[PDB]
């Protein structure tokens, strides 16, 4: 079978017979599990937070307010808030939030915003105009100078 080691400071280390599974129970309540598949699970007792590191670089954090975060090796971060909104942060600077009703809110580095409503209509906000596309094919644009243009469908 395995082996148990108890350190004078109270930290305990359990090792499986093959040594591929190691569980460290730190004196402060934290727990670290090293698995045979090389993933490392760390539990923070004070913060009640779980942190999983994968061999490919992926990291997952789970908070006690039911917030979860995924840090991808390519730089992408995905946050799932307690209200189940999902916010993705991309390496190129863009941000996308997906609401529970299916609405998508895209923030771009150039200051523009694109909203795709659950209704199929898209709305675009730029420095020069606000534009709303309707699924019947009509488009209304309100320019910065105040003029309003409605394009009717064919």
């Amino acid at each position: 079978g395995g082996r148990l080691v108890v350190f004078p400071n109270g930290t305990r280390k359990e090792l499986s017979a093959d040594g591929q599974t190691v569980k460290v129970m730190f004196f402060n309540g934290d727990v670290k599990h090293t698995m045979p598949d090389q993933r490392v699970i760390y539990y923070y007792a004070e913060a009640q937070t779980t942190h999983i590191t994968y061999p490919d670089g992926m990291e997952v954090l789970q908070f006690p307010n039911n917030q979860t975060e995924k840090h991808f090796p390519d730089g992408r971060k995905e946050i799932t808030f307690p209200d189940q909104t999902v916010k993705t942060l991309h390496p190129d600077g863009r941000e996308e939030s997906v609401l529970t009703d299916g609405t998508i809110i895209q923030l771009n580095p150039d200051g523009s915003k694109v909203i795709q409503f659950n209704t199929g209509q898209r709305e675009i906000h730029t420095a020069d105009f606000k534009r709303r596309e309707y699924p019947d094919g009509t488009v209304k644009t309100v320019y910065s100078d105040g003029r309003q243009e409605t394009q009717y469908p064919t």
Partner: peptide
């Protein structure tokens, strides 16, 4: 050889 715990985590600061 070092089995001392990690420091406390913090949620990645969000706008909303």
């Amino acid at each position: 050889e070092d089995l001392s715990p990690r420091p406390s985590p913090n949620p990645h600061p969000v706008s909303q």
